[PDB]
Amino acid sequence: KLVKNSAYYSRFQTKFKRRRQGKTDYYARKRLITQAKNKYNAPKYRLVVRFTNRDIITQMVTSEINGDKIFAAAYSHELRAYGINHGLTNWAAAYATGLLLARRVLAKLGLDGEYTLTEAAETEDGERRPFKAILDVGLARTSTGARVFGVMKGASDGGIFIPHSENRFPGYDIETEELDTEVLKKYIYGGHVAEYMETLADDDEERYKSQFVKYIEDDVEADSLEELYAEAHKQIRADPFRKYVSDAPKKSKEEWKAESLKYKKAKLSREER
Amino acid sequence: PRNARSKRALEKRAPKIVENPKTCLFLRGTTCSQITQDAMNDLYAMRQVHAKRFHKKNAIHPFEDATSLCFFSEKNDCSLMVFGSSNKKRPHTLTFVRMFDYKVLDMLEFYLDPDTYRSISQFKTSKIPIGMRPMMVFAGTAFESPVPNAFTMAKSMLIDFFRGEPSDKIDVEGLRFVVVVTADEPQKPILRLRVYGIRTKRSGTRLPRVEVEEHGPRMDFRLGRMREPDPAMLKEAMKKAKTP
Amino acid sequence: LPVTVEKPTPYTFDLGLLLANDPNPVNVPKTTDTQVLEQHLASVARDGAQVLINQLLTTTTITATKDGVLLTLPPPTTPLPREKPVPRNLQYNPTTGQWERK
Amino acid sequence: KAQNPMRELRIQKLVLNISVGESGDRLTRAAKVLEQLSGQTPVYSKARYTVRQFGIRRNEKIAVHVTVRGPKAEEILERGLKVKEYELRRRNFSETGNFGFGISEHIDLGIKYDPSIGIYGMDFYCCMTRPGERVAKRRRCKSRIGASHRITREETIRWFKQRFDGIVR
RNA sequence: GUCCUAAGGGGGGCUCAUGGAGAACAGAAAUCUCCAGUAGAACAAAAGGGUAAAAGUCCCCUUGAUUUUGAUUUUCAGUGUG
RNA sequence: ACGUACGACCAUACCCAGUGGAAAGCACGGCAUCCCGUCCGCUCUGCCCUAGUUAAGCCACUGAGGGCCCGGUUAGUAGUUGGGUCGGUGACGACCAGCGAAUCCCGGGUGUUGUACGU
Incomplete structure (x- = not known):
């Protein structure tokens, strides 16, 4: 008998679009953005780390109702302007990208007219608070010495406060509960x-x-x-915002609109179909 | 309750002196307009943390029989309810239902104006983060009536919908969004629901200068049928348990 | 620009729920223009948000911690209805002097 | 479009299974045969259900299987085809490009006979693929394999005739 | 008459009942491979919408069998570190 | 406009098949010393972006069969209650209203959209 009948398609319940595409863990995302230890109504930041075959994507992401918003971004191809030309997907390029993201966040916030309510209600017995965020790397399995912890280590060294342990850095020993700094260095x-x-x-x-x-x-x-x-x-x-020009062909945004419209296939109309 | 997880769920559903944050159920009737569904999706956006949604059609008339509401409230542990339906007499209706002891406490119908409804996607501004509660501003002369009426009933229901989670402290950064409801006493008055984003500017003094920008959905409502609670169970509803 | 508004009837506040009640009438203009209608609604929302910020920053104590600048709010006073009514495999071995299972 | 070198058929995996049907020394000796043939530790497979007529019970180890890959897969599959004299059947091939055969003596495979172990039968099965199987197996962005990339029974028979110079009847 | 580091928790991997096509013993029913497989299996409950990369089924760690504090609830205390 | 990474709706997005894909990006891929995990480097992890390719993934279009999403129709109709108006032994006879269906029928469609970086 044919299982895929009219009854099966009628009661079929599709999953989420990104869940079908295998890109978003919606179970972990719900715990990320709807749960907090304190209820002070403060905004929350998540450092999104993604790894492709030839590039590393580090983003500073806030979650809103209509969609996520990006605060800052650092890339392994911007490391070419910083002198790193080979090994754009190793641990060292990830740690440099995380360090670059940390410096860009501090430079954007000015920690390296409109004014905030924190400055309005600032007390004389108050100090500068470090920028706090949590790590989100997605569906990637992570052993000890994973490259996504280098983005964590680069961001923490740059000045971003991320709550973390040292049990997964390269050089850590489970038996002695110690981390080898020489292997880490x-x-x-x-x-x-x-x-x-x-x-x-x-x-x-x-x-x-x-x-x-x-x-x-x-x-x-x-x-x-x-x-x-x-x-x-x-x-x-020294310079967190050095501009990078790639070797790819360069055109204006309107020129890429016209080029792709020439190569686009238009949908057939009702009269034609 | 032999299972430990089922026992924990039973203890969570058990009555407490300090009550849990209220859960709202969004359920759709047999016939519903797309404007009402978009309004339901907009109301779910401000309350993503503490709400559950039904995806099928229900043959329920709230002002005739509400046994299915009490069954859904008992099963899903929901005390608030938003019910959407459409009709020839009532084109776009949002039926807000509040429950007490898994029984219907009070319901109110909201007739939504279709020509003046703009969604959150239609406004291209910075949106509210998920989980942050907004502040509330109620303005007009219809909310201070000496007799309990529908506008005071809608004021308490909108307060409970946007209450969020209670907290003794709050950050100054979490005061950037405000929900404004305007309704004036009098042919039927129009209840307007406005949500704004707040920007602060220097004014030369200690107090900042507040500026507003439209963020949320532009909803216009007219109050219709109203079911008032029985005063005996109403008295039990307003009983304030002393926190230990 | 001034940071204080003046109305014939003063505002009422419930800082536990971040609620500001405006008993003054909102004179909505009798025009068919949506632009002047939303401008008047934003002006009332501007006045409501201004008195909410001023009340929170002057009548609530301010504490600067590592989490941030926090304001300790009074408990909520608006009456709201409640949702619910107010309320072995172990024996001892004599010849070895230990504990073991069955 | 069939000229593309990434449509070339190759062995995905080769699974060698011995089903003694009873736990104890016979299962251990069959595990030793599979460990000697491959060089890797074997797997103990338990019965899913209990049937009294066959002497099996739930959560009781009844079978041992070893999956052999790498260039070790082609040399063991060559040993299996040497036992079968490079002769197979059209009914042996599956509809999705995979095929296999069953033998009864690992002595014929090239293992010296030991009286402490004995002679055990084996079930050989070779799975085939094309480059592109990572899409359906990866954790992130897992998808399905397209119809034109799926291997048919005619393609794997033509591959078997071309590679091993065998005969299919 | 034998065998059992007890349950539970967290994390990771996999998809089940059945039907069809096949394979020395193996023949309706032993074992393996492929396909179709909304759950039609299993686990809980008693849906009129429970669970499918899981709440099902297999691996890693805990097994510590009922942790500590409280000027805070209720009750008790001629033995009031309560 | 296209691609990638986070997302909002969560089938107009799903099941099957075919055709095409300029640029870049994804992707297939090559090797197991180190980090790491398996019966098996399948997965995961580590290195390579050099060599081969759009074959598949993905996107766009098309095709049948369903499924799904809208609006009118049904229809203010069945059905459920109140209210009297005189008659009907009475029930109620109709009338006035309040709510308020569904099947069938027709017409349209087979994804939009937010931020960031590039082409």
Whole structure:
């Protein structure tokens, strides 16, 4: 018998659109934005971390009734303006992107006419409060030393207060309940990629050339990774809003409207259909 | 209550001295207009945290028989109710129902003006975050009647709808949205529901200068049929339990 | 611009529910223009929001904590109806001196 | 559009199953055979329901299965086809490109006979795919496989004839 | 006459009853593979709208068998650290 | 206008099939030293964005079969209650009203939209 009958389609209940697309955990999202320890009616910020194949997306997101709003954004392709040209999806690029997002938030808020009610009711016995937010990375499974915690570590080092533990940073030991700072510092300046570069060059030279063809072509060495990464963090902390121009073709917004309208397929009318 | 989760749900549904925040049920009748459905979706947007929604049609007339309301209120633990229906005599009706002890306390019908209804999507402003309660401003001469009437009944119902969660303290940043209801005494007066976003400016003094901008839905209502509570159960409803 | 409004009848406030009641009449203009109608409604909403901010910032105590600038509100006084009426596998081993299951 | 190299058929997985039907030493010896053939630890499979006529019970280990992949899959499937002399049936092939066969002796596979273990039968089954199976298996943005990418029974028979030079009857 | 680190909790993985096509023993009913599979299985309740990447079913951790404080409720206290 | 990442409605969005996709972006993909987890690097995780490709995902369009969403129709009609008006032994006979259906029929459609970054 055919199970997909008129009765099955009549009582069929569709899920949410993003749940069918596999992009949103609506169970975790409801606990994110409708639950709070305190009831002071304060706004809440969530740091959204997403990872693609060639880019890292970090956003500062507020949740409203009609849709989410973005406060600030940092990208791994903006790290090209900061000197980071290869390895845009490793742990070091994620931590630099999280550091860049933290500096952009502080520069936008002025912590690096219209005025707030906090300044209106400010008491003389009051100090500057750090910017507080919670982490949201979505559906990505995370083991110890995940790259989404580098975005957490970069944002926390930049000046964003995120409540967190240290049990998932690279170098942590479950048995001793301790975190190895040397392994963490090795991950900070890209020593794990540098160790892979030296190990591959000693063992399999053909595999070393295939995986790191861009590093050899642009003359990026394993020993110079620590200097290159540390110089990028200084430049991020100095100029948080450096403009980046990519190598993609550049046109105006109206020109992209006309180009896509030429390549768009119009829907057939009632008379034609 | 052998199951621990079922026992916890029974204790949550049990009466308490300090009551839980009230839950509103949004249910649709057999015949309903799209304007009433959009108004129901707009009212659900301000109360996403403490509401449940029904997606099917119900053959219920609230002013004839309300046994199904008491069954839905008992099952879903909902004390507030918004009921939408359409008719030739009443084109767009929002039936607000408030319950007490899983029984119908009071109901009121709201006739929505179709030509002056604008939704939240039609206003391109910054919207309210989900979970934040707005402040309330009630203006007009129809809310201070010496006798209990429908406008005072609608004032208490709109207060309960936008009450949110009680709190002894509040942040200054959570005072950026206000809900304004205007209704004047008198042919039928028009109850106008306005929601505004609040911007603060320097005025040279300690107190800031308040500026408003339209945020929420532009709703115009006319009060219709009203069911007043029985005074014996009304007296039990206003009994104020002393907090320990 | 002044931060205080003047009306023939003073406002009434319920700071527990953030409620401001305006007993003064709202003279809605008898015109067919929606622009002048919403401008008058916004002006009344401006006056209601102004007296709400002034009452909250002057009659409620202010405490500056790490969470933020918090105002301690009085308990709510508006009467509202309630929703509900007011209210083993363990024995001892003698020869080993321990506890063990059946 | 069929010239695309990512429509090339390849082995998704190869599952070797032994169903002794009873727990104890016979299941342990069958697990040792599968561990010796593959080189990886086996899986103990329990019975879903209890039927008294067959000597099985719920939550009782009755079968052992090992999924063999990598280049180890082609060499074990070659061993299975060497036992079967590269001869299969049209009724053996499934409708979605997967196929398999059943043998009765791992001694014929190339394992020396041990009296402490014995001879156990096996159920061979090879699953096929094309590049693009990550879409239906990934956690984030999981979707379905399109009809033109699904493998038909005629395509896997033509692949079996072209690769292993076998005969299908 | 045997076997049981008890329940529960949190997290992660998977989809079930049945029907069709197949495969040495295996033949209506043993085991495996594919397809169709709104739940027609199971778990709870007694829906007139319970649960499907779960509330079902398998893995990891806890098993600590009833934690502490309170000038706050109700009751009790000739043994009032209550 | 198109793509991506968070979203609002939660089938006009679902089930099946076919055709096409300029740019970029997603995506398939290549390798298991380190982080990590499995019977199996399937999943997850780590590295690569170099090499191959729009085959599938995704988007757009089309096609049948259903399903779904609207408006009129039904119709102020069935049905349920009150009110008297005289008659009817009475029930009620009709009348006036208050609420207020559904089946059938017809016509239209098979997704809109918020923020941010790019093409």
